[PDB]
Structure 1
Amino acid sequence: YYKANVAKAGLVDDFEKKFNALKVPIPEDKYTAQVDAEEKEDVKSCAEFLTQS
């Protein structure tokens, strides 16, 4: 419908196609280091506090 509303329709189809081509880069995780904190504080609290207990 938009293209029907445009005069330079071929440009509209070009843009639509290219848009379909572009996919937003999927951003990534860098913070399994918080899982590292999970494990580290796990051993810390468990061993020291929970066995001194």
Structure 2
Amino acid sequence: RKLALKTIDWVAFGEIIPRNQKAVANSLKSWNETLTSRLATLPEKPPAIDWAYYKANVAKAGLVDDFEKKFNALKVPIPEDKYTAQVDAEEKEDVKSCAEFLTQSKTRIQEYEKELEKMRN
């Protein structure tokens, strides 16, 4: 693991015209920050083991080898995705925003500015 990245956007937070999440985003960013700091903290890697020399200094040297093989050959799986609708249940609710609220909002605007012109006249 390894995971990529989007910066704070406070404008975003407030707006969520899916009302059922309005609070959540404020809290959810702060949950994020928990991860953000936590990841920035740690490195990815320990070292490894020179089993040859440790076998020299372990008289039960079989052990070093056995655990060596199992460990070094082993790879444990990255904590696995369960959710990826985020992108989606957004970008669709972002259309929800645009088309649905874009159109209605832009069409309203036009009438306003249309009467003003003649009101400047």
Is the TM value for this pair above 0.5? yes
* Deviations 1:8-49 (CA, angstroms, capped at 9, x unpaired): 001111111111122112222122110122222112100122
* TM-score (normalised: structure 1): 0.77
Q: Look up the SS of the partner of 1:51 in the other structure.
A: helix
Aligned length in residues: 53
Counterpart CA distance in 2 for 1:50 and 1:30 is 32
Distance 1:25 1:8 in 2: 31
Deviation at 1:4, TM superposition (A): 1.1
Moved more, 9-18 or 21-30: 21-30
Question: Could you state the TM-score of these two structures normalised by the residue count of structure 2?
Answer: 0.39
Task: Establish whether residue 36 from structure 1 lines up as the match of residue 88 from structure 2.
Answer: yes
Displacement of 1:51: 0.6
Structure 2 residue aligned with 1:14: 66
What stretches of structure 1 move > 4 A for 4+ residues in a row? none
